[PDB]
Amino acid sequence: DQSNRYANLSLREEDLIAGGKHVLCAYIMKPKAGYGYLESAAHFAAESSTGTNVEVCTTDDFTRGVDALVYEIDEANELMKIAYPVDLFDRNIIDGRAMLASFLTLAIGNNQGMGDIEYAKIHDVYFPPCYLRLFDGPAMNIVDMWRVLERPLVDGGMVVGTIIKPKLGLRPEPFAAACYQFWLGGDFIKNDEPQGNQVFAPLRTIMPMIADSMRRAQDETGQAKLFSANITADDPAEMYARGEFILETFGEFADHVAFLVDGYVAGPTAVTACRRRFPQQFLHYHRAGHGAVTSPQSKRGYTAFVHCKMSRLSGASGIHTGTMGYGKMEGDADDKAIAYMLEQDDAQGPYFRQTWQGMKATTPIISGGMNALRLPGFFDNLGHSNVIQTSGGGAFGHKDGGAAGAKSLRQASLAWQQGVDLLDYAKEHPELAGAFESFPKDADALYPNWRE
Amino acid sequence: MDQSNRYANLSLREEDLIAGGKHVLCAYIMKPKAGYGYLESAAHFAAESSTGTNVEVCTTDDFTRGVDALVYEIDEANELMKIAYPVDLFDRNIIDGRAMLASFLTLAIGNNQGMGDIEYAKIHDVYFPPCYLRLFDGPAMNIVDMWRVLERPLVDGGMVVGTIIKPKLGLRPEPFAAACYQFWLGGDFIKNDEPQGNQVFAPLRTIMPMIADSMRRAQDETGQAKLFSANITADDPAEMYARGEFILETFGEFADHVAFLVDGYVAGPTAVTACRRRFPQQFLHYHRAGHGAVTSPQSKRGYTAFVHCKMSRLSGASGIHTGTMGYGKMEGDADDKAIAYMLEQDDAQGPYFRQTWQGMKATTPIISGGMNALRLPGFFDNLGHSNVIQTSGGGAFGHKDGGAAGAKSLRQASLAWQQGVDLLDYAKEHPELAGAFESFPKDADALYPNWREK
Amino acid sequence: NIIDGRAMLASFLTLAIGNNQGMGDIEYAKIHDVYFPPCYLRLFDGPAMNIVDMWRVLERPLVDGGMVVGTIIKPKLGLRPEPFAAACYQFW
Numbered sequence: 001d002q003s004n005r006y007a008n009l010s011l012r013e014e015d016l017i018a019g020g021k022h023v024l025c026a027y028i029m030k031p032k033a034g035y036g037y038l039e040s041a042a043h044f045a046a047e048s049s050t051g052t053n054v055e056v057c058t059t060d061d062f063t064r065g066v067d068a069l070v071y072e073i074d075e076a077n078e079l080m081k082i083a084y085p086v087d088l089f090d091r092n093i094i095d096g097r098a099m100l101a102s103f104l105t106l107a108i109g110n111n112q113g114m115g116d117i118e119y120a121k122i123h124d125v126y127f128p129p130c131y132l133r134l135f136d137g138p139a140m141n142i143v144d145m146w147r148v149l150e151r152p153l154v155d156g157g158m159v160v161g162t163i164i165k166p167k168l169g170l171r172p173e174p175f176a177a178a179c180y181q182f183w184l185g186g187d188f189i190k191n192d193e194p195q196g197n198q199v200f201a202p203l204r205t206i207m208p209m210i211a212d213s214m215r216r217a218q219d220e221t222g223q224a225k226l227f228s229a230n231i232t233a234d235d236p237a238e239m240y241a242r243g244e245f246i247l248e249t250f251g252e253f254a255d256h257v258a259f260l261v262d263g264y265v266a267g268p269t270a271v272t273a274c275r276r277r278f279p280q281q282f283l284h285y286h287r288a289g290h291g292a293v294t295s296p297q298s299k300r301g302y303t304a305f306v307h308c309k310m311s312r313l314s315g316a317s318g319i320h321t322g323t324m325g326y327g328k329m330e331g332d333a334d335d336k337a338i339a340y341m342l343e344q345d346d347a348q349g350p351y352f353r354q355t356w357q358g359m360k361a362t363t364p365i366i367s368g369g370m371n372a373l374r375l376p377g378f379f380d381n382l383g384h385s386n387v388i389q390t391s392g393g394g395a396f397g398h399k400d401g402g403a404a405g406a407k408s409l410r411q412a413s414l415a416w417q418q419g420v421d422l423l424d425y426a427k428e429h430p431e432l433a434g435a436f437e438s439f440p441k442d443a444d445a446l447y448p449n450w451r452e
Numbered sequence: 453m454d455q456s457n458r459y460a461n462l463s464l465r466e467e468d469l470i471a472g473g474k475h476v477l478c479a480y481i482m483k484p485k486a487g488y489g490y491l492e493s494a495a496h497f498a499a500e501s502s503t504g505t506n507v508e509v510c511t512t513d514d515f516t517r518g519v520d521a522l523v524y525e526i527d528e529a530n531e532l533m534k535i536a537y538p539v540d541l542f543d544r545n546i547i548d549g550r551a552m553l554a555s556f557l558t559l560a561i562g563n564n565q566g567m568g569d570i571e572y573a574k575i576h577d578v579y580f581p582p583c584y585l586r587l588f589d590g591p592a593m594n595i596v597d598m599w600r601v602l603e604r605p606l607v608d609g610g611m612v613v614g615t616i617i618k619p620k621l622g623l624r625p626e627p628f629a630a631a632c633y634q635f636w637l638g639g640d641f642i643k644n645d646e647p648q649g650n651q652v653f654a655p656l657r658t659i660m661p662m663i664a665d666s667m668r669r670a671q672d673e674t675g676q677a678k679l680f681s682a683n684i685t686a687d688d689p690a691e692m693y694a695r696g697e698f699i700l701e702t703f704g705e706f707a708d709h710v711a712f713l714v715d716g717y718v719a720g721p722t723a724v725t726a727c728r729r730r731f732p733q734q735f736l737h738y739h740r741a742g743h744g745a746v747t748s749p750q751s752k753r754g755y756t757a758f759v760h761c762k763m764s765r766l767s768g769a770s771g772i773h774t775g776t777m778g779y780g781k782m783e784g785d786a787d788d789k790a791i792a793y794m795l796e797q798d799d800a801q802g803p804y805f806r807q808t809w810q811g812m813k814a815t816t817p818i819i820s821g822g823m824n825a826l827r828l829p830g831f832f833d834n835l836g837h838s839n840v841i842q843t844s845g846g847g848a849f850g851h852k853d854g855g856a857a858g859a860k861s862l863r864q865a866s867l868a869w870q871q872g873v874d875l876l877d878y879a880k881e882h883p884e885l886a887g888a889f890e891s892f893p894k895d896a897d898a899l900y901p902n903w904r905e906k
Numbered sequence: 907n908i909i910d911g912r913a914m915l916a917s918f919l920t921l922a923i924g925n926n927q928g929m930g931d932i933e934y935a936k937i938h939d940v941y942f943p944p945c946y947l948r949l950f951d952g953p954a955m956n957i958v959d960m961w962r963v964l965e966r967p968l969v970d971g972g973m974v975v976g977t978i979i980k981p982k983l984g985l986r987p988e989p990f991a992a993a994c995y996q997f998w
């Protein structure tokens with residue numbers, strides 16, 4: 001029992017916040033059978049800061065000053081809050097900046113394997129100014145795409161995008177062909193998360209072809225076109241080489257290219273590798289694999305809200321927030337709070353209010369089983385459409401091709417921005433009307449009388 | 453949309469798929485959500501893990517279908533799902549054509565973990581065929597390199613007696629270096645606790661020269677080489693490189709006594725590979741802090757500890773924490789010994805797949821987590837050998853007589869097991885080991901009830 | 907740039923105020939204003955930090971944070987390290 005040392009329930013959360021010297025974390029935790037709640041929380045805090053499972057002869061009074069402390073519990077609700085003194089976290093020797101790997105190592109590291117704990121999951125975290133100030137933060141935003149697209153730099157509207165489908169299998173020539181088609185009616189194309197340098201579609205062969213499709217589509221449409229290329233790799237040198245080659249290839253239009261990183265499976269080190277080597281390129285955070293812990297089915301790790309929040313510290317220009325229940329992946333309408341926390345200077349989490357002291361915003365990237373017919377309902381819940389939207393099947397699954405699917409996705413956006421029913425808007429826009437016939441199951445559910 | 457006709461081929465024989473050597477096989481424990489058929493859900497699973505989506509797209513061609521991932525076995529009653537991944541699906545480096553673990557994870561355990569029609573899915577085993585396994589870095593060093601520096605036999609050299617500098621955080625540079633010197637008087641190996649680095653109260657540039665001094669002094673008085681494992685984990689690879697370069701420079705003539713520790717689960721495979729490829733001649737100490745978020749048996753998602761450790765060998769970890777197999781404080785079971793065998797043998801058996809490694813270098817298990825002198829004999833009885841790196845933080849500095857005594861007790865206990873001498877009989881003629889019983893009486897009572905009257 | 911396609915101020919100077927400053931038939935010429943259209947201005951790096959970053963570190967308001975009280979170490983040259991560091995501490 002280490003409760004006397006690592007537990008101080010007499011501390012008030014409002015004082016700990018006002019002090020600005022603690023990183024607060026709200027966990028949903030349940031001990032194993034035969035273990036008390038507070039005793040378990042104190043051991044949790046010990047193994048997440050300075051302690052072990054026994055007393056050691058090397059502990060001194062200074063060590064006790066940086067102990068993480070349990071300052072609030074609710075056994076009936078399985079709630080536990082721990083305050084981490086900021087001095088616990090690692091710092092770079094090259095520039096003294098903070099690092100996300102240290103926060104994860106402590107707040108959600110060895111404590112996920114303790115035997116006396118059934119589970120524990122982070123649902124919120126408060127970063128004080130002196131800590132948040134040390135993180136890279138985003139360097140670019142959807143604002144940078146709006147600028148290239150010559151759109152309003154505030155409330156510039158939805159960026160009409162897609163994902164090249166098939167996820168894998170398209171050889172270079174058909175790949176660039178599909179890119180050209182979508183860009184005839186769309187703005188943004190991203191690599192599907194695993195596309196890179198497969199033997200049947202080498203990167204050095206496909207990228208010059210994608211650049212040509214961009215140049216052609218730009219000349220025929222008179223509009224700028226954006227791309228997002230996957231550079232994820234185990235070796236940072238491979239990431240750099242991919243980024244360099246892609247920039248030289250796209251040449252004068254290199255500022256039209258975002259860099260995608262599978263940051264959850266590759267890790268924050270991959271994300272920060274791209275963030276610091278290519279700060280002038282839009283960092284597209286793809287969260288493939290996050291569901292292993294973020295799913296509500298899981299009681300361990302951290303929630304999607306916390307995952308996306310930490311991505312703003314790492315410096316993502318945009319990150320996938322999910323369809324918030326309107327797509328094919330797990331999500332809830334209340335996930336709108338994730339978007340607000342990423343784009344605003346002041347927003348509310350499940351437990352903690354967070355100010356960002358002017359740190360740049362991260363743009364929500366909405367994707368996953370979406371199409372023209374599903375966008376109005378999704379935006380009614382979010383409250384605005386100033387997001388990046390990518391619909392793979394929603395565009396190429398269009399019976400009339402990707403170019404019409406792109407136009408249908410755009411038309412769906414304007415229909416919502418102006419408060420016009422999608423069916424009423426579909427009578428004067430064949431591409432949108434074709435989406436209804438392309439996805440009749442969705443049409444029957446969202447607009448029952450569409451055939452008439 | 454039922455996609456079983458395309459992504460499901462239950463007529464394929466697993467033995468043929470392994471014989472062909474052209475598919476990565478994965479065995480999942482998967483349960484669909486209510487109202488979704490098992491096979492149709494599994495077909496969708498394979499589609500979102502290879503070439504497909506949730507609707508038909510006009511871009512699909514016959515070539516695409518050729519590289520589809522295929523469900524070749526399902527046991528609905530037992531929630532089993534096996535998928536075969538054509539090796540051509542996975543990404544390759546443009547600089548050297550080598551494989552990357554990030555791509556395998558993106559496909560085999562990426563977006564499929566967020567599908568709304570699946571309740572959960574967890575990988576329990578994976579088979580890598582030769583043509584794919586051959587493309588991974590694999591380990592460059594081993595406990596054999598530690599045995600060589602320690603001037604011990606390079607086969608069955610025995611346990612490396614190690615510890616973790618406790619407190620986990622808070623020890624300033626001077627007491628830190630003092631605890632290091634004391635343990636090395638009786639021990640072999642010291643590792644940073646997983647979060648120790650460049651805290652403002654213990655700067656790296658200040659503490660590292662003191663650790664090297666403690667290493668030098670201990671080596672001079674004991675006439676034995678001493679090892680240290682330094683944490684270099686960071687978000688920025690430039691920081692990782694800077695730390696490694698400074699540490700190697702500081703240790704100078706004893707730079708080969710230093711291992712580099714990387715918190716590979718939270719920092720990711722990119723941090724592990726960054727160290728593996730920049731410092732291939734320094735022992736790579738993979739620390740898995742955070743892994744329990746998926747590997748815990750309580751979790752039905754992600755991958756098991758067995759799968760996590762097996763992949764660490766592909767990334768090139770010289771050693772990784774396999775857990776205490778139920779004999780320590782962390783979660784584990786005695787059957788986790790299969791993890792060690794899969795890491796250190798050229799031919800081992802997994803829960804579903806037998807794996808040969810074609811001479812790829814072994815990864816050494818690291819045993820840690822609430823261990824001490826009393827708990828080691830039972831753990832090695834279950835493993836069958838003591839060729840591991842053992843670190844006991846509380847087991848060493850929790851000794852009533854200090855860290856030095858704790859180190860001797862750990863070594864003495866290991867020798868006791870290696871020569872088949874009961875621990876209590878060994879304590880009769882080794883005071884340091886005897887003190888370990890009094891230091892941890894709750895453990896002495898359980899594992900050696902009659903320790904007091906003897 | 908061939909490495910990233912960005913603009914370079916050097917090219918602007920070379921053309922707008924380069925060889926034209928040595929012509930024999932011109933007594934003098936001096937730029938008093940210049941307009942950069944969006945498609946050109948958008949290709950420049952632009953500032954990455956501001957006084958806002960200074961206000962943040964000083965824990966001041968990020969809008970209308972006020973004057974940053976500063977000095978230049980004098981003598982311009984000749985202060986050895988010890989007195990130089992002593993002058994720094996005094997002003998801070």
Ligand SMILES: O=C(O)[C@@](O)(COP(=O)(O)O)[C@H](O)[C@H](O)COP(=O)(O)O
Nearest residue numbers: 163320322329367368369391392393505
């Ligand atoms: O492969 C996919 O599954 C997607 O392209 C959606 O496909 P479609 O749009 O083509 O149907 C998105 O990447 C995922 O939704 C990513 O997950 P999240 O948004 O949840 O990060």
Ligand SMILES: O=C(O)[C@@](O)(COP(=O)(O)O)[C@H](O)[C@H](O)COP(=O)(O)O
Nearest residue numbers: 052616773775782820821822844845846
């Ligand atoms: O912080 C800790 O808990 C440890 O230093 C153990 O300290 P003690 O020896 O004092 O218990 C190790 O990191 C864990 O053993 C890692 O767990 P695993 O090896 O299972 O990944």
Ligand SMILES: [Mg+2]
Nearest residue numbers: 163191192193
């Ligand atoms: Mg995708």
Ligand SMILES: [Mg+2]
Nearest residue numbers: 110616645646
């Ligand atoms: Mg540790």
